[PDB]
Every structure is written in structure tokens, then in C-alpha cells.
Amino acid sequence: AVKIRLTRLGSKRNPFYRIVVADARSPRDGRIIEQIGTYNPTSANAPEIKVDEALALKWLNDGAKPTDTVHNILSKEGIMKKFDEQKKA
Amino acid sequence: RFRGSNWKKSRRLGISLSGTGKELEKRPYAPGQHGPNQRKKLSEYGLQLREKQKLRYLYGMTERQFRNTFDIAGKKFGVHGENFMILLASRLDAVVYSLGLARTRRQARQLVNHGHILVDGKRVDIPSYSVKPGQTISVREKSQKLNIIVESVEINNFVPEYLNFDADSLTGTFVRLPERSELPAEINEQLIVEYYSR
Amino acid sequence: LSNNIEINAYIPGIGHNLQEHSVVLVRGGRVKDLPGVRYHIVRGALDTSGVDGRRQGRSLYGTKKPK
Amino acid sequence: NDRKVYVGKVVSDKMDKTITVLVETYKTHKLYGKRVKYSKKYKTHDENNSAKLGDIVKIQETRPLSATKRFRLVEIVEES
Amino acid sequence: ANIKSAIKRVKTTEKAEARNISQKSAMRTAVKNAKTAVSNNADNKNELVSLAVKLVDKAAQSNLIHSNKADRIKSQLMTAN
RNA sequence: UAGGAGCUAGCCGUCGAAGGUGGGACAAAUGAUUGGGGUGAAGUCGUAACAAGGUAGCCGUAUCGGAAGGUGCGGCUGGAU
RNA sequence: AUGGAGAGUUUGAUCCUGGCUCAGGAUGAACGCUGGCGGCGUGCCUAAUACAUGCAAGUCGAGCGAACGGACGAGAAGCUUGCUUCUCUGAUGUUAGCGGCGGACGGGUGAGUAACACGUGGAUAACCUACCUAUAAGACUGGGAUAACUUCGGGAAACCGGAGCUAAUACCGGAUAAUAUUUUGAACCGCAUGGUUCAAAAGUGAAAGACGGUCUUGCUGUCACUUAUAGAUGGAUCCGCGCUGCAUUAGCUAGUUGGUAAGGUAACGGCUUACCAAGGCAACGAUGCAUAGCCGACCUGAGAGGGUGAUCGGCCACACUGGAACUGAGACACGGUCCAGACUCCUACGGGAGGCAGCAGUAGGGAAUCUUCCGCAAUGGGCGAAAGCCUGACGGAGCAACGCCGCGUGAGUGAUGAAGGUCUUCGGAUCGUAAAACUCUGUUAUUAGGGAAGAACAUAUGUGUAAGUAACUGUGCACAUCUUGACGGUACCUAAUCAGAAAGCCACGGCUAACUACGUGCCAGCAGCCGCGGUAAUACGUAGGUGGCAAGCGUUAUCCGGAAUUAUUGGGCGUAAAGCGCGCGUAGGCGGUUUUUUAAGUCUGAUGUGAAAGCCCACGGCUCAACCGUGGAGGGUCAUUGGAAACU
């Protein structure tokens, strides 16, 4: 379906993911629906989680699914933890 | 870079600042074979080339290191002939010569590449790194002394304008960037800007 | 040539290995004061070696750099 | 919503309810900036043979009722 | 080096089309005769559709036909009804 | 019975890709030989044009001469008396 | 308005005019010669030539038949007291089916296509949509087969031809409700037509498993199932404009051109079929030819901009060729089917097969463009709760200076003459504070020991909460317990190490800074224009200096600036190239003068507002940097919007 993924950047052996929620029928670096935020877990300490969680309230409620690695940083950073009450509507 | 011995280099180019001077021994007109002859000049286009040659050979780099700084002199919208020099004066090449860490720059510009100079903290291996003014230009504590390190500190004091220093393991501060008046008239800096115009 | 066009190509250098049927390489580059012929012959590349007794034009004419 | 509602003026009403209005305007050479008049007829379907000769017909686009019939009739002003 | 799906699909679509030419041919049986027998005001002039509108929605209740085609069927069927 | 209705099958005529030639058309390549042109050497002969270049040019045209040129009729000076 | 000079070139000597030539950039460049190391990109441009092999799309016992092996109690003992040799409890796995999904994804190519194809702006009152998410209708009934097993046959073959059998959440018949549907009336724009209640014959679903705990089940959680809405996806259809050139292509079409009725499409009609008039299309060059995927993007231009597409993204087209269909929500399907064709292969000669433009590799052609490489660790996708498989996507390694950035080829001395020749009317400064003969440093390098991030995010590891539930797994949501890493012990850090082992090339004529001797005798040969050599060449060829600048230097070819030789900006037509022999004239263009309407054109103002690497300005990440993000700027060009009339 339409789903959040990990679309990367950066030079050799160094990724810079900006997340994208888009269809699974596209390639991993293909044309998108929405580039929400970035996620650079590859640092010395931080995962550098920048998130604009306002639009997960839309797409996860009418068709978008978190998928098995983009699902559990939301359970880690707390993006879906705010959605936990927002899914409790 | 250059990697020479500057004893004939004071006589070869316009000037290259070897030491106190090296031209007074033999005839100082030319090094040899055609000099004291029909003494021919060259053009003003070649004079700015020669004025480039009095500063390319002075600062010792190649082109597109003396030349790629010139387009960032087009980013700084002051006088192009001298704001090029103030970014050229804002690197680690002023350290290995001017503040005395050897009897020249070559033995000390070796000493940064070993990881035996270690400015701004842990290690800066390269002298192309611009010394962004404010960082503590330090000295490795595992290479404190040599026959060259602390010797020419006593010879040459006055670490130049907007770069201070110490004897506290010979560490500096580089508090700001020096202006064109802290750029010597050994080669006229204004006459490089038009050879790069051509 | 490969595309079977017949030319008249200048053979630079002094000695050669160009008696006949040498499978050679050909540059451009016109020789002036010579009508029709406006192509060079690449020395030392395809089936010829370059000329030997050169010491000021050594990179051209198929001569490897000495020592 | 609506659809596109461009104007024109007839040239030749074809046999059995096909009028052909004329649109023309002024495009330029962007190398020169000088504009020049140019024409592009967009053929309208007349529903009841409403438009006449001389009529500065304002029409309105539709989806194709036939091969050419992309536009339908709203406004007709005069006749010669 | 054709994989086992291509040799399996050709036989399951042999039998799935045998299930598709089961009912669609039986629907194209029905549009050959129940179309031809609803007309001309027959014995079942208004009751023949109880098999026709039965079976053209039996094609619509599965993936046999488009529902607008089933709408296209009732367009010419119930105009006669 | 499987007779009707249909279906598999059966025939029966519309349209078919490709094919088959069929004529051509168009394009390219080649062809014993040839005839205009360019370059070189100008090997050769003549000296036409530039000096009123030894008997001013120039165009349209026409004719002869291998060619240069020869002439003739209209027009032009971009010519001497 | 950060740019816009150039060098020469018609003579015996000038001015104009003119092309031509070089100086300057770049290239997927390639070649001659050279070659330290990293950090980086790019990588058959030719034959959309042909292909051996490997090899690249799968999926699930938590569907249910099977059948196999088989742990599993497994007798009496086979008395060799150790096995199962038997039975059934037979799990899990294998099969190999039936089954649902996928096959249209990832991947590759630009032949066709000069066009709605692409770009961009609109529109559908002509739109569809499995799965996903939410919304409600709810899951009644019967069910044969049917592979599997047995049986006959072929052939080394391959894989088939026949006889009887078998399960299902597979499958098919019976009634159930819906904005279905055509029959009756009340909404407005887009003539037709719509709009949301209306009110009616109607219409039919249907799937049951492993299971938390209960109830030998119930909400069916799981994951579906089929009925009426939506959200979404991608695609469809229809008009604006940007979109190569040839009139040595002018007359183009005849289901064509409009309409008239049937189709049928998610809808439209000349789309086809019976009818009507010749109409419609055109020099504004329809028609046809030739050429070419399009755009973003690249690139250099002062701007006016226009040339590349290997790049790197978005869209289109293709999958030996050419047709036809099936299935599927979605195909006329790159590792589906059939037909026809051409090529290739195996054969026991009976008939069997194959389509590298998926990734390497092979041949070919070419000047030339990667290893028959590794691993899925990350990501991302596929079916499955998950685990698992597939990754020839991807992440890496190889190889190449082909190209970008740093790194190199290392120093204070001391003879201007220690030993030394491109000269001498030699005496000399001299290569040359060069150097033997030393201080010293250890980029790299030699080489022997720590080692790293990435490698964090799950499912694994219960208490729970939320919709809660008959109660509880389940699912979203807090832990904190634990998983694995191609690259890789590579990178990195320590020490030891020698001043260690490393730049090449073209001229030295004038352009242009780098000269002198031997031959040499218009010869060899150089040759960007002018030109050198005929016995005194600085120019050739031979050799020391230097010079331009560094792992390159030089040549070759290719686009741009220089260049305002296409001159809107910013060209000429008397003698230089530019007026037919003159007209008259068809079209076309462009037209005197003075008043008033619109705001169309003009010019402004409220916003939305123009594209990703490319593009303004300032930081962040890179050891510098090469190379990647940030923040507005933001469009100041287009649209949704208000206007103003001198001038059109």
C-alpha cells in the first residue's frame, strides 16, 4: 500500500535518510507522496529524529501503514505514542 | 607543493623570502648563462604574470589553490586584490614559516602532516585547512622540542597581526584575521588580480 | 579507414614500418603547403612503432621515455 | 464545476447543426517581443442552429458529443 | 529456464478459464436466448427477467463482468420491461 | 433418446498478418568504357587581356573557328580624339 | 545590467570590406609517452548484432487432501538385551498437488514515435480502481468432483496418450436487505443535462481454519469472506500553448466531411454499419517526405539565451519478428498461451527445445568503455502474524588518472672553481651555495601490535493501557531485558624505520617569457599565420641551461566564448555581396488629421505562485576539500483576483 519508508542521501558509505510516505509500487528512491521528515541513525550518539507528526494523523487513518522499521522508531521516539491517543478516538 | 631549497630562489624570482638574503655573494643580476646581456623586459600582461610569479612561488602552492581562492575573493565584495590575500593569510601556511617552528617552512610543514602540530585540538593533518580565526593553534605535547621547534621562536618573535602565541608549549590563538597592511610589499598584491583577468 | 574511405595521410617522422599493409592508426591534422593530403599518421600506436633516433620530440614518434 | 467558456464568431455552419466559430488573438516571438495576430478556430456544437452569420458567439466547452463537437452554445449576440 | 509458476499458471488458468468459460459462456448462452425470448411479448413477457436479471447479477456478484455492464444489461432489459 | 434451443463438432461467407508473385516506382552499390572539372608539373606552342598592350571595351544575342578569337545587330561607359 | 580587449591575414605602401586562422574554456573523450597514495564520481557512445553456461519472483500447514520419510507409546522379542521388524499415538519436515496472492514489481533499452508523445495550464454534468484505511450490511443452504492412489501404453530420451478413484477457507445450485435497476414527481447550468431526497417489479452475498480462554465456543481477535459509502493509488478520456526541416513537397481527404438510428465504452462519437449534401482540409504550406523518444536537467553565454542527455530524475514506447486472445482489479504479459515466420540447439531419428535490451561472461564490430566478483548486514519490495525465501534490486569489493580534491618527488649548512661543457678575440663566470661532506625531520612509504563507528531499528525478550474482552492472546501504545554486520580487522591509533623507493613533456624565430655549438646544405626535416634549411639555421636533427606546471605533457576530433561572419537587442543593398528590365497588380504587411465609450493590449495592486542534483543569500556535514543537507529567499515571469484610457 502507501507506506512510510527510508529514502537515503549522502556520499560513500554514509546515508542521510529523509523519510517518505508513498506507495510500495514505486521504487525506493522513486516519486513520492509526502517527504515528512528525516532520520539519520548512523551518528556517534543520536538518531537525529526530526518528525512533523501532524500528517501521520491523516494518512495512518485512511490508508497508510507503518512497515516493520518505520513503525518502531515511532514507538521509540514517541511519534505513534501521540498517535496512541489519536488512534484512541 | 614547492619542496626546494631557497638559496637560489631569492635570486631567481622577484623575491621569495629565503632568509636575511642570498644575492650578495656572486653577481646578483641572474643565476646564469644569459643574464648580463641585452636585458629584455616582458609585457604588463606578463608583469602581472611575473607579479603572480612573485606570489605563487612565494606562498608555494600550485594553481587552483592560489587560483581557487580567487573566486571566493569574488564572494567577498571588497577589494579583490587584497581580500584574496586576507583569506590567503587565514590558513596553516602562515604557521609553519612565520612563527618559527623550523629554520624554514618545509621542516615544519612536514611536522603538521605527521600529526605532530595538532592545531585546534586533536589533529589537523592538512595545511589547506583555513585557520578559522579563534581556534587554538596548538603544538603536540609528544613533539615539544626538536632542533627546530622552540629554536626560531627565540630568533623570530612577533607572531604576526591577529595571531598571538605563547611559550606555553608554543601555542597560539589566531584571534582575528589580519588586513592588507599585514601583507608585505615584498610582492605587490594588487598586480595579481589582472593576470587572473587576462 | 574502418569505414572504407581512401585518404592520403601524412606519415610524420623519419624512419617507419610502413612498407605496405600495415594496420595503422590515423589522426587528423592537415599538413599545409601540400594539396589533398590533410591527415596525419599516428606514430607508434597500431601496427607501427615510432621512429628511433629522436631525443627532443621523444613523447611523440613512439619513443618511450629513457630510463 | 463549469467548463471552459471561450468566445468566437462563426465562419461556416456545416450541414445539419455544426457551426464553426473563429477565435484569434496575439502571440509573440519571445526572441523579439513583437506580438503578432494569429487564429485558432475551436469548433462548437450548435444545439438548435442558434448562431447566425455575423454573430460574435460565446460558447462553452464540453466533453465530445461527437468527433469534433467539443464545445456547446451559451451566448449569441447579433446577425448581419 | 522457465520457473514452476509459469508451468503452474498455464494449467490453473486452463481450469480457471474453464470456470470462466463455464459461466460467461452460460451468460453468453443467456444473452443469446433469454434476450431472444424476452422480446416479442412471449408467454413470460414480464417473468423472463427473473432468470435474466438473476443471472446477469450472478455474473456481477462475482468477478465475471463489470457492474456497469450489468447496468448496461438492465438498460435494454427493463426498457422492454 | 440426448430429437429440438443452444453448445463441441459440421459446413457457409465478411475482414485478415504474413506469404506468393506481379508490374512498376523510389533509393543505394557496381559496371568494360567514357567527358566535364580540380591540383601538380605548367613538359609544350601562341601571346589573346593589362600601356589608345600594336587592330578601345562591355552586356544581350547570333555565327564561324579546336581554342583564343572572328563578325553582326540593339543597348551601356566601366574609353582615346 | 559583476560582462563585451584579442593575434594575424589581400601591397611597392595605405583605408575599407571580407572570409579564414589561432590564443581561452570544456569531453562518457581516446591515443603517444609518463606515472605516489588515499577521499571521491563515471563507467559499449558503435551491432535494437548474435549468444554457451551460471542466474536472476516468489509466497504460505496457521487452507486440505494426500502420500513419503519420520521422532512418537511402540508388544511379543528378531533372544544376536537391541532394536521399532508389527500395530496404532504419529508431530515436524519432504513433497507434489489442489488453493489464494503475485506475475503489469524491482531490472533493462531508446528501435518506433515530429506526436497530446512529452512538458505545462485547465476539465470530465465521460471516469475507473484488487489490495490499504475508515464507514455499515453480515456471514444461512446443499454440494459433485478433483489431482494425489491404482491401471494400460509410448519412447535412451524428453514428456505424454487412456481406465477407475480423492480434500478444502477451492468450487457450483436455493431465498435474504442495499444511492443497483427502468417506471411514476418536487433541485440548476453545460442546450443535452445535474441535484437528493423521492417510490416501486426487482437484485445476492456467504469462508471457513490454527487458536488466547471460554461454552466440546465467541465477539470470529488472527485473515479473510461478500453488500452500500468514502479516503487513497495509479491510469483513462477532452481543449489551451512550447515543440525539426523541405513548395527542387500545393491542391489534401471520400466513412472522409457534418448530421441521421444500433451498438459500448469506466464514457464519447465517422469508431463501424443503412441515410442525406459534397462537404470538410488547406500557401498561416493541409498533404507527403526526411530526421528525432519528450521534459526537467546539463552547458556556456553581459542579458537577449540557445546547443548536450553518458549523466540524474519524471513521463512515453519495447522485450527474435508479426498477428490473436486468455487470465488477472490492473496485460494484449521482458524468465505466460496459441498461430505464422525466420534463426539456433539436442536426438537412440520417435520428436523434443530456445529467445541475455534482468547481472556478469562470450564472440563480433569498434579507437574504446568494468569481475563468467562478494554479501543481503542496512534499506526496499514480494506472500506469510511472525519466523523464513527471493534479491544479478540494493550495500559493498575489483579495474581504469577517464575525470575532481588533498598527498607526494622531503631540509640548515659549507667553494662565486672538489673531480664537470650548448663557448672562448678561453681569462671566465660557470650546470652551481648544485654537489660531494654533514645537522635533521619520517606525508606517503617499511611493518608489527590495539581497532571503530555505521552496528539502530525491530520480532524474539511479562506487567499492562486503548477499541477493550463473557475472560484473555491478538492488535497500536511505555519499558528492558537481546538479534546480527558484505564491507573488515579494511579504514584508524601506536610505536620502530631510512632523508627512504617517485614526476614528465613542448618550444627556445615574431607573436610567446625559456639560446647556444656540431652536423646540415631547400636534403633530412619542422610548419597555429608569417616561414627556417641553397656550407656561417638561434627555426631542422643532434646536446647543457631555462620556461610554462605538475602526475601529467602533447596530439587528434567534438560544442561555446572570443565574434554584433545572421547583426530584435546589435548588418548592408550607387562603384565591394546584396533592385528583376521595368512595371501594373492578387494576397499579405503597414498606413493622414482631430474629439467621446471599453480597460480587451498597455501598466500596476491582494494572494496561490513556478520544479528535485541544476538555480539568490547564510550556515551544517565532510581533515581541507572533492562530495551531501539546512533556513528563508520564491518567484520578481503563471493562475485565482480589482482596476485606470492618453496610445492600440
TrEMBL record, chain A:
GO terms for molecular function: structural constituent of ribosome. The keyword Ribosomal protein applies. GO terms for biological process: translation. GO terms for cellular component: cytoplasm; small ribosomal subunit. Keywords: Ribonucleoprotein, Ribosomal protein. The keyword Transcription does not apply. Pfam families: Ribosomal_S16. It comes from the Bacteria. InterPro entries: Ribosomal_bS16, Ribosomal_bS16_dom_sf. Belongs to the bacterial ribosomal protein bS16 family. This is Small ribosomal subunit protein bS16. It comes from Staphylococcus aureus.
UniProtKB/TrEMBL annotation, chain B:
GO terms for molecular function: rRNA binding; structural constituent of ribosome. InterPro entries: Ribosomal_uS4, Ribosomal_uS4_bac-type, Ribosomal_uS4_CS, Ribosomal_uS4_N, S4_RNA-bd, S4_RNA-bd_sf. Pfam families: Ribosomal_S4, S4. This is Small ribosomal subunit protein uS4. SUPFAM superfamilies: Alpha-L RNA-binding motif. GO terms for biological process: ribosomal small subunit biogenesis; translation. Part of the 30S ribosomal subunit. Contacts protein S5. The interaction surface between S4 and S5 is involved in control of translational fidelity. The lineage of its organism: Bacteria, Bacillati, Bacillota, Bacilli, Bacillales. Keywords: Ribonucleoprotein, Ribosomal protein, RNA-binding, rRNA-binding. The keyword Ribosomal protein applies. The keyword RNA-binding applies. PANTHER family: 30S 40S RIBOSOMAL PROTEIN, SMALL RIBOSOMAL SUBUNIT PROTEIN US4M. Residues 1-89 form the Small ribosomal subunit protein uS4 N-terminal domain. Residues 90-154 form the RNA-binding S4 domain. One of its GO terms (cellular component) is small ribosomal subunit.
TrEMBL record, chain D:
GO terms for biological process: translation. One of its GO terms (cellular component) is cytosolic small ribosomal subunit. SUPFAM superfamilies: Nucleic acid-binding proteins (SSF50249). One of its GO terms (molecular function) is rRNA binding. The keyword Electron transport does not apply. Keywords: Ribonucleoprotein, Ribosomal protein, RNA-binding, rRNA-binding. Belongs to the universal ribosomal protein uS17 family. One of the primary rRNA binding proteins, it binds specifically to the 5'-end of 16S ribosomal RNA. Part of the 30S ribosomal subunit. This is Small ribosomal subunit protein uS17. It comes from Staphylococcus schweitzeri.
From TrEMBL, chain E:
It holds the Pfam family Ribosomal_S20p. Keywords: Ribonucleoprotein, Ribosomal protein, RNA-binding, rRNA-binding. Binds directly to 16S ribosomal RNA. NCBIfam families: S20 (TIGR00029). This is Small ribosomal subunit protein bS20. GO terms for molecular function: small ribosomal subunit rRNA binding; structural constituent of ribosome. GO terms for cellular component: cytosol; small ribosomal subunit. One of its GO terms (biological process) is translation. HAMAP family: Ribosomal_bS20. It comes from Staphylococcus aureus. The gene is rpsT. Belongs to the bacterial ribosomal protein bS20 family. Gene3D superfamilies: Ribosomal protein S20. It comes from the Bacteria. The keyword Ribonucleoprotein applies.
